[PDB]
Amino acid sequence: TLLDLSATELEQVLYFSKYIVLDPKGAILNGVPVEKRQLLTDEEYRELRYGKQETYPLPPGVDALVKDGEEVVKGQELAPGVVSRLDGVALYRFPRRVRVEYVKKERAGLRLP
Amino acid sequence: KISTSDPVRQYLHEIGQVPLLTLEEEVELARKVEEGMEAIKKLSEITGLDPDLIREVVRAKILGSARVRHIPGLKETLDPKTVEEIDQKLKSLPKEHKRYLHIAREGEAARQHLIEANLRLVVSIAKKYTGRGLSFLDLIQEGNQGLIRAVEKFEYKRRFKFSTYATWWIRQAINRAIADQARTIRIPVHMVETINKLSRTARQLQQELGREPTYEEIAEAMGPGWDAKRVEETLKIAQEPVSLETPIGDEKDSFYGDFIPDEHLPSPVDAATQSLLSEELEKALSKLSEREAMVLKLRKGLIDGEEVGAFFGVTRERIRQIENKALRKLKYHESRTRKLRDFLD
Amino acid sequence: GKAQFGGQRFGEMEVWALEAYGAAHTLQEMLTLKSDDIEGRNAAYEAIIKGEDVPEPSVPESFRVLVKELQALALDVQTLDEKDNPVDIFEGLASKR
Amino acid sequence: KARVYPFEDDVEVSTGDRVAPGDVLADGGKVKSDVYGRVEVDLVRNVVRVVESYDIDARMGAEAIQQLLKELDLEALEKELLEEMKHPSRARRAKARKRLEVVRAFLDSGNRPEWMILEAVPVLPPDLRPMVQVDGGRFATSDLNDLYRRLINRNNRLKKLLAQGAPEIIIRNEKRMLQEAVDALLDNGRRGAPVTNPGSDRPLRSLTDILSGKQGRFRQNLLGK
Amino acid sequence: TPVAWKPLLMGVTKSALSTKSWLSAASFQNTTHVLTEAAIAGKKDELIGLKENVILGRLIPAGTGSDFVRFTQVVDQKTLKAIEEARKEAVEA
Amino acid sequence: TGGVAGAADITQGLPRVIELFEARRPKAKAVISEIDGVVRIEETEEKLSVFVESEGFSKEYKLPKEARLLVKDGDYVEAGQPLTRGAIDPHQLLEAKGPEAVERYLVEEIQKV
Ligand SMILES: [Mg+2]
Ligand SMILES: [Mg+2]
Ligand SMILES: [Mg+2]
Ligand SMILES: [Mg+2]
Ligand SMILES: [Mg+2]
Ligand SMILES: [Mg+2]
Ligand SMILES: [Mg+2]
Ligand SMILES: [Mg+2]
Ligand SMILES: [Mg+2]
Ligand SMILES: [Mg+2]
Ligand SMILES: [Mg+2]
Ligand SMILES: [Mg+2]
Ligand SMILES: [Mg+2]
Ligand SMILES: [Mg+2]
Ligand SMILES: [Mg+2]
Ligand SMILES: [Mg+2]
Ligand SMILES: [Mg+2]
Ligand SMILES: [Mg+2]
Ligand SMILES: [Mg+2]
Ligand SMILES: [Mg+2]
Ligand SMILES: [Mg+2]
Ligand SMILES: [Mg+2]
Ligand SMILES: [Mg+2]
Ligand SMILES: [Mg+2]
Ligand SMILES: [Mg+2]
Ligand SMILES: [Mg+2]
Ligand SMILES: [Mg+2]
Ligand SMILES: [Mg+2]
Ligand SMILES: [Mg+2]
Ligand SMILES: [Mg+2]
Ligand SMILES: [Mg+2]
Ligand SMILES: [Mg+2]
Ligand SMILES: [Mg+2]
Ligand SMILES: [Mg+2]
Ligand SMILES: [Mg+2]
Ligand SMILES: [Mg+2]
Ligand SMILES: [Mg+2]
Ligand SMILES: [Mg+2]
Ligand SMILES: [Mg+2]
Ligand SMILES: [Mg+2]
Ligand SMILES: [Mg+2]
Ligand SMILES: [Mg+2]
Ligand SMILES: [Mg+2]
Ligand SMILES: [Mg+2]
Ligand SMILES: [Mg+2]
Ligand SMILES: [Mg+2]
Ligand SMILES: [Mg+2]
Ligand SMILES: [Mg+2]
Ligand SMILES: [Mg+2]
Ligand SMILES: [Mg+2]
Ligand SMILES: [Mg+2]
Ligand SMILES: [Mg+2]
Ligand SMILES: [Mg+2]
Ligand SMILES: [Mg+2]
Ligand SMILES: [Mg+2]
Ligand SMILES: [Mg+2]
Ligand SMILES: [Mg+2]
Ligand SMILES: [Mg+2]
Ligand SMILES: [Mg+2]
Ligand SMILES: [Mg+2]
Ligand SMILES: [Mg+2]
Ligand SMILES: [Mg+2]
Ligand SMILES: [Mg+2]
Ligand SMILES: [Mg+2]
Ligand SMILES: [Mg+2]
Ligand SMILES: [Mg+2]
Ligand SMILES: [Mg+2]
Ligand SMILES: [Mg+2]
Ligand SMILES: [Mg+2]
Ligand SMILES: [Mg+2]
Ligand SMILES: [Mg+2]
Ligand SMILES: [Mg+2]
Ligand SMILES: [Mg+2]
Ligand SMILES: [Mg+2]
Ligand SMILES: [Mg+2]
Ligand SMILES: [Mg+2]
Ligand SMILES: [Mg+2]
Ligand SMILES: [Mg+2]
Ligand SMILES: [Mg+2]
Ligand SMILES: [Mg+2]
Ligand SMILES: [Mg+2]
Ligand SMILES: [Mg+2]
Ligand SMILES: [Mg+2]
Incomplete structure (x- = not known):
C-alpha cells in the first residue's frame, strides 16, 4: 500500500523468490528504458548482466563442424544467422564476435599456445 | 508458493542450461581453480599481503560490489577506498605478476561455476539422508556447504574426477549436520552412532522373542561394556522432548504448561518465613559478641560454608571457645523464650 | 493438583458483575494480588501475616507477560506518564546490565 | 564486441586498454568503461572482450524493499495523493485515498515506516520458553524454542555460506528458508505451517498464536485467572 | 471549515x-x-x-475509582485545630 | 430468522433481538416511504406498485406479489413509514426519517420481543 508495488502480488513475487525489481538505475534496455520500479525475470535478467546471448553449440565429430566453425570463428565478426555448415546446420543466430575452444585431428592453424 | 519445487527448478534449470561435461568442463574449471591458488599465493609473495586479503579482494571484483562486503561482513574493509587500493597494486604488477591477477579472478569464477554445476549432485545425495530429522532444504544446504569444502582440496593432478570426491566431502557434512542440529538438546556424534547401534540391535532382538527386549538383551547383543543402566540411560536421552504446548486430556483446549508448578519462587509461606527468621536471627546477632558469632554468621550465611580460616587473627582456641559458648547461651536462652524451637523448617 | 486445592476461576461474566458494582479494588485484587501479581501476592501474604492492611497492587504478570510477548513481535508497547513520557512496569529488570 | 588494439584518450579516466603495454581495464569479471559495462580479458592476442550490459541495480527480497522504504519522503507522496485524491475520476483517486491513510498516520504522530523491515529479531525471554524436567527424565519446553533454533541455525548457515564462497542459487535458497523462519516465530500458518518432527502435526505456537490463538493471551486475559 | x-x-x-x-x-x-x-x-x-x-x-475507570471521589480526605475536629496550629506557627518572629 | 419457503414474513424471539442490535436486512423487508406525501396504487398482472407524491414529486415503489400492503389509495405516508408489512431496516429508516427515528425504532422494536 505504502510502497506502490503490486499491493499483493509484486511483493510475494520478489519477497520469497528471486524476481528482481530495478531499485535505483539500470541504463541498458529490454526494449524500453530502465524500469524505475518494475520487476523482471531471472531469464531476461541473465540476458542482461553478462551479455545479450549465450550460445555454446559444440560440434559432433572432429573434422566436419570443427572446420566450418574454426575458419569463421577467431577474428571474423560473425553476423546473426551465421550458418555454420556441417552437422545439420550449426545455427548461430545472434550479434557481434565469436570464441571457439578445442581442436582434435584435422589440421592445426591459428590456435592458442 | 511452495518452497521445494522452486529451488529444485531453480538449480535444475541452471544445470539444465549448464551441466558440466564429464571430463572437459570439470577439468577446465579445476585447472583454473588451482592456478588461482598458485596465483593468489604468488600475489601474496610480491605484495606482502596475506593470501586471505588477496582472496577477498578478487572475490569482491568477481562476485559482488560494495553491497556484498558491507552487509555480510560488517565493516573493516572500507566499502570503496580499501579494496580499490588493493586492486591498484595488482595493476602495478607488471606483465609478469599482472598475469597472476588476471588468472586469480578467472580462477575464482571457474570455481563458482564448478560449484553451480555440481548442485544436482548434492540434492541427489541429500535426497537419501531425508528422514533423519533435518529439513530437505536444510539437508541439501549443509551438503552444499560440503561440496564447497571439497572444492578446496581437490587435486586435479591426481586423475580421479570431482564426482566421487564431492560424494565423500558432502556425506560428511550432512551426517555432521544431522548429528549437530537434529536435536533440541545436542548429542555428540558418538552418542548418535551409539543410539543407532542401540536401535538396530533392538531391531534384531524384536526379530524372534515376541518380547520387546528387556534391557538385558540389548546389553548383551550390543557388546563389551553394555549394561542395563547404560541402555536405560541412552534411550532416555533418545526420547526427544515433548511439546510444552501439546493438546492435553480431552484435546478440546488443553495446554500442557499451565500444570507445571514453580520452585525458586517463594510461595507466600516462604516469604513470611524469611521475614520472621531474618528479623529474629538479626535480633540475636546484635546483642552479642561480634567476634565469633559474625565469623560463623558470615562464614556460614554470607559467602560459602574452616575453623582456623574462619577467625581473623585469633587462633582456633578462641574460635571453638566463643563459637560453642555463645552458640549455646544463644540456644539456651532461645529455649527459655521459645521463638526458634518451632522449626521454621 | 494433589494436596493444594487450586484456585477458583474468575470469569468475564464474573468480572462484569464486579464492574457493575463499584468494586474497583475488589476487582483489581482479583486480577493482581490474588492471581497474577508475582510481587504482589508475596507482599500481600506477608502483609497479612504482620497484620498489615494489605499493600497497593503492583503490576500483574499477565500484563508483563503480554508486553513482552508483544515485544517478541516487532511492536513496542511503552507505558506513559501524565505528560507523554515513560513510566515503569517492569520494576528494574529491563534497564540494561 | 571484441577490441584488439584500444588506444589512450585521457578526457575521462583511461578507458579500456592501450596498444599492448598498459591495460587499465579490470580483469575479466566486472568493468564499466562506456555505455557497455563488462570486460573479459584474453591475453592471447591483445583482446579486451567488452560486453555491453551496464550497472543495473537488481535486488530481490527484503533487501530491495528495505531500500525502497528508506528512499520515500512521505510528505511528497502525501501532497501527491492529495492532488490525485480530489482531481481525477473515482478509479485512481479512490486507490489514492486508501493509500493516503497509511502514509498520514506514519507522519501524523508515532513512528516512521523504515522499521517494518526486519534485520534484528527480538527473542522472547527464557523462563517464558522453559526447558523443564518432567517424568522419568522427560523434559518440557515452550514450542517457541524449536522455532528460535530454526532461525538461528539458518541465520548462522547463511553467514558461513557467504563467507565460504557464494554460489547464487544456494544463497537465495537459504535466504528463502531464513525468511520463512522469521515468519514462524512471529506468526505460523499465514504462509504454510511448521511442525515439530513426526509426532504431532501441530502448529508450533507462534508468538502470534500466543497473543490471539484459539486460547491466547488477550483472549484468556479475559476468560479468567 | x-x-x-x-x-x-x-x-x-x-x-x-x-x-x-x-x-x-x-x-x-x-x-x-x-x-x-x-x-x-x-x-x-x-x-x-x-x-x-x-x-x-x-x-477500574468506573466505580470507586471515579475521578470524582478517588480523592477525599477525612478529619477529626481535633486534627482540624492541629493543622491550623501548624498555620499559626507560620508567623515568623 | 425464518426459512426460505413461500411467504414467511417476520422474525421472533432472540433471532430478532440479534437482527435488531446488529443492524440487519430483515427476512421480509418492508419498503419505507422516503417521501412524505400521498398514496396511489396500480392493477396489472405481475407486480404491484405504490406511489407516494406531493405537489413536488412522486416516487415509484416496486412491491412484488408477496408484499401485503398496509397503505391504501388515498392518504399520507410520513417519511420512513411502513409501506410494506413487517420488518424495517434501521439503515433505511435512518436515511428516511432520521436517527432520531431509527434510534426510537430500534428501542421499541426490541422491547416488542
Ligand atoms: Mg498496485
Ligand atoms: Mg489487480
Ligand atoms: Mg494493487
Ligand atoms: Mg513467488
Ligand atoms: Mg518507478
Ligand atoms: Mg533473478
Ligand atoms: Mg573479410
Ligand atoms: Mg530470441
Ligand atoms: Mg590438432
Ligand atoms: Mg606460481
Ligand atoms: Mg621480486
Ligand atoms: Mg561490529
Ligand atoms: Mg584497525
Ligand atoms: Mg569506489
Ligand atoms: Mg561504484
Ligand atoms: Mg612468474
Ligand atoms: Mg525414507
Ligand atoms: Mg552412494
Ligand atoms: Mg534405540
Ligand atoms: Mg544395519
Ligand atoms: Mg523405546
Ligand atoms: Mg488429561
Ligand atoms: Mg511461589
Ligand atoms: Mg527486622
Ligand atoms: Mg536479645
Ligand atoms: Mg555493631
Ligand atoms: Mg550488644
Ligand atoms: Mg541490643
Ligand atoms: Mg554465629
Ligand atoms: Mg566471613
Ligand atoms: Mg568458592
Ligand atoms: Mg584479617
Ligand atoms: Mg572453653
Ligand atoms: Mg574458659
Ligand atoms: Mg556464652
Ligand atoms: Mg518438647
Ligand atoms: Mg521489592
Ligand atoms: Mg503487593
Ligand atoms: Mg496488625
Ligand atoms: Mg505500614
Ligand atoms: Mg507498587
Ligand atoms: Mg510492543
Ligand atoms: Mg588499427
Ligand atoms: Mg569537462
Ligand atoms: Mg511519484
Ligand atoms: Mg489519474
Ligand atoms: Mg486500485
Ligand atoms: Mg485501525
Ligand atoms: Mg520488511
Ligand atoms: Mg526421574
Ligand atoms: Mg526444526
Ligand atoms: Mg542466477
Ligand atoms: Mg538462479
Ligand atoms: Mg494471523
Ligand atoms: Mg504446513
Ligand atoms: Mg510443514
Ligand atoms: Mg517439519
Ligand atoms: Mg522440531
Ligand atoms: Mg518432515
Ligand atoms: Mg492460527
Ligand atoms: Mg489464532
Ligand atoms: Mg471477545
Ligand atoms: Mg483509593
Ligand atoms: Mg483528619
Ligand atoms: Mg513554635
Ligand atoms: Mg512581634
Ligand atoms: Mg510574639
Ligand atoms: Mg423449511
Ligand atoms: Mg421448502
Ligand atoms: Mg417462493
Ligand atoms: Mg461473531
Ligand atoms: Mg466480521
Ligand atoms: Mg443485503
Ligand atoms: Mg390501484
Ligand atoms: Mg400495473
Ligand atoms: Mg402480498
Ligand atoms: Mg398516516
Ligand atoms: Mg401489522
Ligand atoms: Mg442524514
Ligand atoms: Mg433525511
Ligand atoms: Mg423525520
Ligand atoms: Mg439526518
Ligand atoms: Mg421512527
Missing part, C-alpha cells in the same frame, strides 16, 4: 469491533490486524473504559 458528516448506523458487533482503544479491539476482532494498524499510527490508548483498563490490572 465546516466538517460535513452523515449519521451512520452500524451493528453492535461492528460498533465495538472498531473503536478508539486498540486494547479493546485486540481482545476480540483480529488481534493480528487491530495491532498492525494501532502500531503504524502510534496509537496512544487513553485508558477509559473498563475492558482496556482491566488488562492493565489497573483500577
Whole structure:
C-alpha cells in the first residue's frame, strides 16, 4: 500500500523468490528504458548482466563442424544467422564476435599456445 | 508458493542450461581453480599481503560490489577506498605478476561455476539422508556447504574426477549436520552412532522373542561394556522432548504448561518465613559478641560454608571457645523464650 | 493438583458483575494480588501475616507477560506518564546490565 | 564486441586498454568503461572482450524493499495523493485515498515506516520458553524454542555460506528458508505451517498464536485467572 | 471549515469491533490486524473504559475509582485545630 | 430468522433481538416511504406498485406479489413509514426519517420481543 508495488502480488513475487525489481538505475534496455520500479525475470535478467546471448553449440565429430566453425570463428565478426555448415546446420543466430575452444585431428592453424 | 519445487527448478534449470561435461568442463574449471591458488599465493609473495586479503579482494571484483562486503561482513574493509587500493597494486604488477591477477579472478569464477554445476549432485545425495530429522532444504544446504569444502582440496593432478570426491566431502557434512542440529538438546556424534547401534540391535532382538527386549538383551547383543543402566540411560536421552504446548486430556483446549508448578519462587509461606527468621536471627546477632558469632554468621550465611580460616587473627582456641559458648547461651536462652524451637523448617 | 486445592476461576461474566458494582479494588485484587501479581501476592501474604492492611497492587504478570510477548513481535508497547513520557512496569529488570 | 588494439584518450579516466603495454581495464569479471559495462580479458592476442550490459541495480527480497522504504519522503507522496485524491475520476483517486491513510498516520504522530523491515529479531525471554524436567527424565519446553533454533541455525548457515564462497542459487535458497523462519516465530500458518518432527502435526505456537490463538493471551486475559 | 458528516448506523458487533482503544479491539476482532494498524499510527490508548483498563490490572475507570471521589480526605475536629496550629506557627518572629 | 419457503414474513424471539442490535436486512423487508406525501396504487398482472407524491414529486415503489400492503389509495405516508408489512431496516429508516427515528425504532422494536 505504502510502497506502490503490486499491493499483493509484486511483493510475494520478489519477497520469497528471486524476481528482481530495478531499485535505483539500470541504463541498458529490454526494449524500453530502465524500469524505475518494475520487476523482471531471472531469464531476461541473465540476458542482461553478462551479455545479450549465450550460445555454446559444440560440434559432433572432429573434422566436419570443427572446420566450418574454426575458419569463421577467431577474428571474423560473425553476423546473426551465421550458418555454420556441417552437422545439420550449426545455427548461430545472434550479434557481434565469436570464441571457439578445442581442436582434435584435422589440421592445426591459428590456435592458442 | 511452495518452497521445494522452486529451488529444485531453480538449480535444475541452471544445470539444465549448464551441466558440466564429464571430463572437459570439470577439468577446465579445476585447472583454473588451482592456478588461482598458485596465483593468489604468488600475489601474496610480491605484495606482502596475506593470501586471505588477496582472496577477498578478487572475490569482491568477481562476485559482488560494495553491497556484498558491507552487509555480510560488517565493516573493516572500507566499502570503496580499501579494496580499490588493493586492486591498484595488482595493476602495478607488471606483465609478469599482472598475469597472476588476471588468472586469480578467472580462477575464482571457474570455481563458482564448478560449484553451480555440481548442485544436482548434492540434492541427489541429500535426497537419501531425508528422514533423519533435518529439513530437505536444510539437508541439501549443509551438503552444499560440503561440496564447497571439497572444492578446496581437490587435486586435479591426481586423475580421479570431482564426482566421487564431492560424494565423500558432502556425506560428511550432512551426517555432521544431522548429528549437530537434529536435536533440541545436542548429542555428540558418538552418542548418535551409539543410539543407532542401540536401535538396530533392538531391531534384531524384536526379530524372534515376541518380547520387546528387556534391557538385558540389548546389553548383551550390543557388546563389551553394555549394561542395563547404560541402555536405560541412552534411550532416555533418545526420547526427544515433548511439546510444552501439546493438546492435553480431552484435546478440546488443553495446554500442557499451565500444570507445571514453580520452585525458586517463594510461595507466600516462604516469604513470611524469611521475614520472621531474618528479623529474629538479626535480633540475636546484635546483642552479642561480634567476634565469633559474625565469623560463623558470615562464614556460614554470607559467602560459602574452616575453623582456623574462619577467625581473623585469633587462633582456633578462641574460635571453638566463643563459637560453642555463645552458640549455646544463644540456644539456651532461645529455649527459655521459645521463638526458634518451632522449626521454621 | 494433589494436596493444594487450586484456585477458583474468575470469569468475564464474573468480572462484569464486579464492574457493575463499584468494586474497583475488589476487582483489581482479583486480577493482581490474588492471581497474577508475582510481587504482589508475596507482599500481600506477608502483609497479612504482620497484620498489615494489605499493600497497593503492583503490576500483574499477565500484563508483563503480554508486553513482552508483544515485544517478541516487532511492536513496542511503552507505558506513559501524565505528560507523554515513560513510566515503569517492569520494576528494574529491563534497564540494561 | 571484441577490441584488439584500444588506444589512450585521457578526457575521462583511461578507458579500456592501450596498444599492448598498459591495460587499465579490470580483469575479466566486472568493468564499466562506456555505455557497455563488462570486460573479459584474453591475453592471447591483445583482446579486451567488452560486453555491453551496464550497472543495473537488481535486488530481490527484503533487501530491495528495505531500500525502497528508506528512499520515500512521505510528505511528497502525501501532497501527491492529495492532488490525485480530489482531481481525477473515482478509479485512481479512490486507490489514492486508501493509500493516503497509511502514509498520514506514519507522519501524523508515532513512528516512521523504515522499521517494518526486519534485520534484528527480538527473542522472547527464557523462563517464558522453559526447558523443564518432567517424568522419568522427560523434559518440557515452550514450542517457541524449536522455532528460535530454526532461525538461528539458518541465520548462522547463511553467514558461513557467504563467507565460504557464494554460489547464487544456494544463497537465495537459504535466504528463502531464513525468511520463512522469521515468519514462524512471529506468526505460523499465514504462509504454510511448521511442525515439530513426526509426532504431532501441530502448529508450533507462534508468538502470534500466543497473543490471539484459539486460547491466547488477550483472549484468556479475559476468560479468567 | 465546516466538517460535513452523515449519521451512520452500524451493528453492535461492528460498533465495538472498531473503536478508539486498540486494547479493546485486540481482545476480540483480529488481534493480528487491530495491532498492525494501532502500531503504524502510534496509537496512544487513553485508558477509559473498563475492558482496556482491566488488562492493565489497573483500577477500574468506573466505580470507586471515579475521578470524582478517588480523592477525599477525612478529619477529626481535633486534627482540624492541629493543622491550623501548624498555620499559626507560620508567623515568623 | 425464518426459512426460505413461500411467504414467511417476520422474525421472533432472540433471532430478532440479534437482527435488531446488529443492524440487519430483515427476512421480509418492508419498503419505507422516503417521501412524505400521498398514496396511489396500480392493477396489472405481475407486480404491484405504490406511489407516494406531493405537489413536488412522486416516487415509484416496486412491491412484488408477496408484499401485503398496509397503505391504501388515498392518504399520507410520513417519511420512513411502513409501506410494506413487517420488518424495517434501521439503515433505511435512518436515511428516511432520521436517527432520531431509527434510534426510537430500534428501542421499541426490541422491547416488542
Ligand atoms: Mg498496485
Ligand atoms: Mg489487480
Ligand atoms: Mg494493487
Ligand atoms: Mg513467488
Ligand atoms: Mg518507478
Ligand atoms: Mg533473478
Ligand atoms: Mg573479410
Ligand atoms: Mg530470441
Ligand atoms: Mg590438432
Ligand atoms: Mg606460481
Ligand atoms: Mg621480486
Ligand atoms: Mg561490529
Ligand atoms: Mg584497525
Ligand atoms: Mg569506489
Ligand atoms: Mg561504484
Ligand atoms: Mg612468474
Ligand atoms: Mg525414507
Ligand atoms: Mg552412494
Ligand atoms: Mg534405540
Ligand atoms: Mg544395519
Ligand atoms: Mg523405546
Ligand atoms: Mg488429561
Ligand atoms: Mg511461589
Ligand atoms: Mg527486622
Ligand atoms: Mg536479645
Ligand atoms: Mg555493631
Ligand atoms: Mg550488644
Ligand atoms: Mg541490643
Ligand atoms: Mg554465629
Ligand atoms: Mg566471613
Ligand atoms: Mg568458592
Ligand atoms: Mg584479617
Ligand atoms: Mg572453653
Ligand atoms: Mg574458659
Ligand atoms: Mg556464652
Ligand atoms: Mg518438647
Ligand atoms: Mg521489592
Ligand atoms: Mg503487593
Ligand atoms: Mg496488625
Ligand atoms: Mg505500614
Ligand atoms: Mg507498587
Ligand atoms: Mg510492543
Ligand atoms: Mg588499427
Ligand atoms: Mg569537462
Ligand atoms: Mg511519484
Ligand atoms: Mg489519474
Ligand atoms: Mg486500485
Ligand atoms: Mg520488511
Ligand atoms: Mg526421574
Ligand atoms: Mg526444526
Ligand atoms: Mg542466477
Ligand atoms: Mg538462479
Ligand atoms: Mg504446513
Ligand atoms: Mg510443514
Ligand atoms: Mg517439519
Ligand atoms: Mg522440531
Ligand atoms: Mg518432515
Ligand atoms: Mg492460527
Ligand atoms: Mg489464532
Ligand atoms: Mg461473531
Ligand atoms: Mg466480521
Ligand atoms: Mg471477545
Ligand atoms: Mg494471523
Ligand atoms: Mg485501525
Ligand atoms: Mg483509593
Ligand atoms: Mg483528619
Ligand atoms: Mg513554635
Ligand atoms: Mg512581634
Ligand atoms: Mg510574639
Ligand atoms: Mg423449511
Ligand atoms: Mg421448502
Ligand atoms: Mg417462493
Ligand atoms: Mg443485503
Ligand atoms: Mg390501484
Ligand atoms: Mg400495473
Ligand atoms: Mg402480498
Ligand atoms: Mg398516516
Ligand atoms: Mg401489522
Ligand atoms: Mg442524514
Ligand atoms: Mg433525511
Ligand atoms: Mg423525520
Ligand atoms: Mg439526518
Ligand atoms: Mg421512527
